[PDB]
Design a protein around this ligand. Structure first.
Ligand SMILES: Nc1ncnc2c1ncn2[C@@H]1O[C@H](COP(=O)(O)OP(=O)(O)O)[C@@H](O)[C@H]1O
Ligand SMILES: Nc1ncnc2c1ncn2[C@@H]1O[C@H](COP(=O)(O)OP(=O)(O)O)[C@@H](O)[C@H]1O
Ligand SMILES: Nc1ncnc2c1ncn2[C@@H]1O[C@H](COP(=O)(O)OP(=O)(O)O)[C@@H](O)[C@H]1O
Ligand SMILES: Nc1ncnc2c1ncn2[C@@H]1O[C@H](COP(=O)(O)OP(=O)(O)O)[C@@H](O)[C@H]1O
Ligand SMILES: [Zn+2]
Ligand SMILES: [Zn+2]
Ligand SMILES: [Zn+2]
Ligand SMILES: [Zn+2]
Lengths: 783, 783
DNA sequence: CTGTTACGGCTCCATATGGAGCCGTAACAG
DNA sequence: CTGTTACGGCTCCATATGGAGCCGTAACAG
């Protein structure tokens, strides 16, 4: 009953040997990058998944005894398909179909109650429920411009180059229809434009092909630009491009129900399937509980009503008390999707599986922790084991086994520091997490807080989603934290309104604004910058030294040496993305590709350059006994001491060290960077830039996957940034960040359609005095 | 701790409700087609696999509580890839690589010891170990024939039709090389033929394209027939066609080792990696056990030697004591692959998984049951549960829970007859399996056995595989059973030699014969027929009524009625594969195809014909109150009484009923037929045909997935077939079939390279008197 | 009448070019 | 000297026709 793992050396683990107990609550804690995520995901989950899949990416581990099939729950989601909804994912729609087939009355089979089968799906919308076609205005935004000027901006239909296939198709269509490309689009007859857009509907046409050395003709049909784009979207970066020219509208016949008339006719207690499926989860549970039926109906529907009640109770106990069963699963955030999946797993009944979670209490107010922990304990008691990777102080007190990694990060960290229960790690003298739990070092509350300087941002007519037509004022030049219960609409109010409008007004961005009437004070904000968890770059030619800009200065320093001047090199010669200095064998990528007869291409280190990404001639030049490869393979901590003489590089290196990246090296590929490292890199880049006093910064849950020490360091960095003159607005839930803020805006008083208004606004002391605010009560308790 | 399933209605189950205990040995027993396989595979395994996959084909079941992820072990295998071998599948090659890297001495990393990575794979053969190219003789078997006559018989390169693309390519090549297609291939210059076969190696050539209404020219390169075929095979029915023209040969450099010279240089105790990997499993285990090393080597290699010893012990305990670790996994039978997978799962250490097996004791002699049961019990004790579907009398006595289905088959069967331990089902009066276990009805041994009629089949120079140059004599006109321990070479001796040579001599088949010198007495066998478990047909237009030939007679009977003569129909008008009588809406298929926007095509019953596969005009004709659809939807049991008047149909229907197919209906699609039903259909078809007295029948394990009653019925059918004059040779392991045979040939005395000679031959009484024969000892015990 | 041989018709399965994002470089302004 | 703006070069990701097996049918022989 022990998951014994011996000889674990994946990534930066120093040959650890742990003994995780089975069927007990085990939490893994460590600093950002200490290896807490590697030990779980790269080793244990990978080994379990491989063991199961090979029966029905081997980790670098000697042997693991006692493993079980594992399921990973992470805050990742994709577009998936419009067919899948919340009701389908939660596996409640099937039971609803069974209930409607068994007890529904005409106004009776479970085959026509679903939109996934031809029996009941609406023929007009094919069961999707929203005809997503291509808007003619989006296809040709500039009707005044002629065809030669590039009226058709859609990909795959550009006639800019006469040698392109699209140009040949356009010429063939013009020949068939007796038209001229140079003629203006508006001046062209509407019939010709309609025929070009919608194609010939299979009509036979003559097409002439002209090439550099080949001439001929062939007979075929013209699908049309719109039809070809629709076919490409149906057969499908590309998805986003297709959606950019597509406008979503409800089906004219079914009115978004995505069901046939006969299926919608059957109703239970005066409400059809769509009425039940398009309400709040709490309201639906209340309606189901109060439902009354005859003795025979109760006897024949008990086995379905019990399951429906249990699943709805679990879903509302997880924390989602505002969702709608008809909501499309594509438009779900990471936290909502993760909690939906956790509820589905708790309700399915799977037994004997290792569950590996990724910070379950993400994007969730502190008032719901007492119920999320109960749900997790019920899941554990179902007959499973948990590998919850949690940092919140409220999670450790309700666990059984605590495994703390460290003691540092990167190269320093990786070894198991201390294990045991909460008390043992609390009394352990050499544990950072235990030290913070004991209260030896705590985030001290500020004494004096900044006051607004008379400049305010005004929001008028905020009515997007569930906003109840509220007006808010955000002070400028003072740290601002926007709190609120789950589903209150704060995330919408920020992202879909304020950031979008500011980007449109300042950066000339092209995004759809929110349902906001007017915004006052825009002229006082020179620039707006959004910091997210997305990686800095996807190509291998991007490193935390190139992004920060220190690489250009270091290249200039290398080129200013005596040897470089003697050999007549260039400032940019020592770069791995230009021709002349990089190793020509691998073209500067640093990894060669070898293809086998029946295997995918396997990447191996380059033999000529030995993985240094540079030629021998470039490495010949030495600066203070170090070459370009040695510098690129040196960590920031050593670089701080190495370049103390030159202040231009020293300032940026010190900024990067102060952000908290003193364990990675300047040559790490951007692919290997995680979300936290990317956020820290972006923060360092923003800090390095000169302060203009009119900068707006927006952070969306900055404490995602950060330990308490990382939270303290980020609080210090944010306060230092705010002291420079710029103002930053942060959507936060952690009480540590909230208690050190300057101005707090609270949105409530409940989630979903119940809330959406402003409850309290002002200093934290003022908010703590309001009885009708959970955030105020918690702030009073902390203070 | 109960896998409770309620409301199971998949296939032909009559709403059963069972309670399978957890972590205990559970065996499912029933007649062939009673639903024992459905309840396991279609319901429980499908539900478990779906539940697990949806977390990282919904069964028609209400709800299942307590399920766990399930792994299905079945006697199915594919070509897979040449990379995978027995050593790779068993997951021993990785530990061997680790051992060689850690303790191997030069004559040291685990990266160059594998052929799956560029570090150690042989560059010449790309790590495959056998250069499988296209033989020039196979490409052009008839060099005398000209190009126009069809010299190139390879698919995708035929020039029979001048309008084909291959013909255009051939014409372009002839124009470029100044050659004539009409010229004989032999008379053509060798250089031109070599250039055509191997392509132009990227050389630019001129190609002229001529079509019905399009004329032009283009510049490209000719890949060549051989290169195109090789590329198609690499990028890949099709596999068999590609392998037909490909001859496997060992790599000239590595001599089949598939490793680099440096990797092969390292040796342990005078033997390199290939020497250890190319020996018997028992010999390898003995060599590893006797290996000696220093104290430090023992300390650093204990963790690998222990695992290697344990895995080899498990593999030899399963029953495979003759395999070679270097054997390619493609050339493995169903039983060997299933037992390899079972050994791998027993050794991996997976815990908390439902294991669903498919007759583990398949193709295994009765002497290894006492060890196979021990291995299965060890797997169960590892912390799992088992759903072994077994029929052998030696398996029930070592089980914990017995679930018996029935009481009949098809429509009659499906309900749970009796459950409990072995004693309770034995004392149950209404259980067929319990009745046979108690001994109420048993297969009585014959009193007098047939003697050879002086005609014998002579095998001279049998040396294929492990055969030790033996000569055997098979009597003609008497039932012959070929027994032998696992791996003795009986399967090779039969399939790869006798059947192949007989087919080549009589049916003019084109297969590679075995290593046989000469065969005497071939002229005494007029026809040879092989009966296998393959389905009768794959297309939906094939039924157990069309294959037997009764459908033609029934169509003639329908056309001979008064109404058919009045309306002037045809004899073949009432068929679902011709134009005129079938429902034109679905073109006689009976299922319409509906395609959605983002879903695969979903098959639904045809609306016009309502699933009857016929038009209204055809159904208007009524014969004795029954139409063609009613007849096609009528079971054989009713058809026996219905057509008692006409003897032409009655004979075939009675034969089909006597075979044991009195539960399926004449309209069942061949896709839904299983292996046992296909074998029974083939037996009925062979029995219906007239007896010529010179027919040879070969059966390969006919008792696969048959209950004891089915075994008795098949024994009776085989004896009736033999009494007609024809002789049948059966490879059997079950003692029930063996004890009722007439002539027995025993091959031993061990498996693999140890055996291959003939031990005993003659009547079962004579064989039972030989001390050096396990089959003889078991026959003595039974008798 | 029944079996065999050959042929016709049917269904199923198999086989390079443009856009987005980033890094480097020249020019300009405070 | 430092920040900003515009442009060039590089890498990654996206989009019908023939052969095999079976069923039906005409012709022929015992
Ligand atoms: C990379 O990957 C290694 C593992 O990082 P990891 O612990 O997964 O980060 P995080 O805990 O923030 O996910 C780090 O040493 C870093 O250098
Ligand atoms: N695509 C959508 N369609 C309809 N309603 C939506 C959509 N997206 C969000 N909403 C509604 O807007 C609200 C936004 O809440 P949100 O700000 O995401 O809460 P939190 O800040 O806790 O994540 C939700 O209650 C949801 O009901
Ligand atoms: C088909 O499928 C049903 C289930 O057959 P099944 O029990 O799986 O056969 P078997 O046990 O021989 O595999 C049968 O009723 C038959 O009509
Ligand atoms: N492709 C092959 N290459 C080398 N040896 C083979 C191959 N196929 C079979 N053999 C050998 O021929 C023997 C045939 O055994 P077989 O009679 O099939 O076993 P069983 O009696 O269990 O059916 C095996 O011992 C095997 O070692
Ligand atoms: Zn519709
Ligand atoms: Zn290189
Ligand atoms: Zn080789
Ligand atoms: Zn039809």
């Amino acid at each position: 009953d022990y998951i014994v793992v011996k000889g674990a050396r994946e990534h930066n683990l120093k040959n650890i040997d742990v003994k995780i107990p089975r069927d007990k609550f085990v939490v893994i804690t460590g600093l950002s990058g200490s290896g807490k995520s590697s030990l779980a995901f790269d080793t244990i989950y990978a080994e379990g998944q491989r063991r199961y899949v090979e029966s029905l990416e081997k980790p670098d581990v000697d042997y693991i005894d006692g493993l079980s099939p594992a399921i990973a729950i992470d805050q990742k989601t994709t577009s998936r398909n419009p067919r899948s909804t919340v009701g389908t994912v939660t596996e409640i729609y099937d039971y609803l179909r069974l209930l409607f087939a068994r007890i529904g009355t005409p106004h009776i089979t479970p085959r026509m109650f679903s939109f996934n089968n031809p029996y009941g799906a609406c023929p007009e919308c094919t069961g999707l429920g929203s005809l997503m076609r291509i808007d003619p205005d989006l296809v040709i935004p500039d009707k005044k411009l002629s065809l030669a000027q590039g009226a058709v901006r859609a990909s795959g239909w550009n006639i800019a180059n006469d040698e392109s296939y699209a140009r040949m198709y356009i010429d063939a269509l013009a020949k068939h229809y007796n038209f001229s490309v140079d003629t203006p689009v508006e001046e062209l007859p509407p019939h010709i434009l309609d025929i070009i857009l919608y194609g010939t509907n299979g009509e036979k046409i003559k097409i002439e092909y002209e090439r550099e050395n080949e001439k001929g003709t062939f007979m075929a049909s013209f699908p049309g630009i719109i039809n070809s784009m629709e076919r490409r979207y149906k057969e499908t970066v590309m998805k986003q491009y297709y959606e950019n020219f597509m406008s979503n509208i409800p089906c004219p016949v079914c009115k978004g129900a995505r069901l046939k008339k006969e299926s919608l006719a059957v109703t239970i207690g005066g409400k059809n399937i769509y009425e039940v499926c398009c309400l709040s989860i709490g309201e639906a549970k209340e309606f189901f509980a109060n439902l009354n039926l005859t003795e025979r109906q109760q006897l024949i529907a008990r086995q379905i009503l019990k399951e429906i009640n249990a699943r709805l109770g679990f879903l509302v106990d997880v924390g989602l008390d505002y969702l709608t069963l008809a909501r499309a699963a594509g438009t779900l955030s990471g936290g909502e999707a993760q909690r939906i999946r956790l509820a589905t797993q708790i309700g399915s009944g799977l037994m004997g599986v290792i569950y590996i979670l990724d910070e379950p209490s993400i994007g969730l107010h502190q008032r719901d922790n007492d119920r999320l922990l109960r749900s997790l304990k019920k899941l554990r008691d179902l007959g499973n084991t948990l590998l919850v990777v949690e940092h919140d102080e409220d999670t450790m007190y309700a666990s059984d086994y605590i495994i703390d990694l460290g003691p540092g990060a990167g190269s320093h960290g990786g070894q198991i520091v201390a294990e045991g229960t909460v008390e043992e790690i609390k009394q352990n003298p050499n544990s950072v997490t235990g030290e913070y739990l004991s209260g030896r070092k705590k985030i001290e509350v500020p004494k004096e807080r900044r006051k607004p300087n008379g400049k305010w941002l005004e929001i008028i007519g905020a009515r997007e989603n569930n906003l109840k037509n509220i007006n808010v004022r955000i002070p400028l030049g003072v740290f601002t934290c926007i709190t609120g219960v789950s589903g209150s609409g704060k995330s919408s109010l920020i992202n879909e309104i304020l950031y979008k409008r500011l980007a449109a007004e300042l950066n000339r961005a092209s995004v759809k604004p929110g349902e906001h009437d007017l915004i006052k004070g825009i002229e006082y904000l020179d620039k707006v910058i959004d910091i997210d968890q997305s990686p800095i770059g996807r190509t291998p030619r991007s490193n935390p030294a190139t992004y920060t800009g220190v690489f250009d200065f270091i290249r200039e320093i290398f080129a200013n040496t005596t040897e470089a001047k003697t050999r007549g090199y260039k400032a940019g010669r020592f770069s791995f993305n230009v021709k002349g200095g990089r190793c020509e064998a691998c073209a500067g990528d640093g990894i060669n590709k070898i293809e086998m007869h029946f295997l995918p291409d396997i990447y191996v280190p380059c033999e000529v350059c030995k993985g240094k990404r540079y030629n021998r001639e470039t490495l010949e030049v030495r600066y203070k006994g170090k070459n370009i490869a040695e510098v690129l393979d040196m960590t920031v901590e050593e670089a701080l001491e190495f370049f103390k003489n030159i202040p231009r590089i020293h300032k940026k290196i010190e900024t990067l060290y102060d952000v908290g990246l003193g364990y990675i090296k300047l040559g790490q590929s951007s692919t290997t960077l995680s979300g936290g490292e990317a956020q820290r890199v972006k923060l360092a880049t923003e800090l390095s830039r000169k302060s203009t006093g009119k900068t707006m910064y927006i952070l969306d849950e900055p404490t995602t996957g950060l330990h308490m020490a990382d939270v303290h360091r980020l609080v210090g960095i944010l306060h230092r940034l705010v002291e420079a003159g710029n103002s930053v607005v942060v959507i936060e839930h952690n009480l540590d960040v909230i208690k050190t803020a300057d101005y707090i805006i609270d949105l409530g008083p409940e989630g979903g359609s119940g809330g959406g208004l402003v409850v309290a606004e002002g200093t934290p002391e003022e908010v703590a005095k309001v009885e009708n605010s959970y955030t105020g009560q918690f702030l009073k308790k902390v203070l």
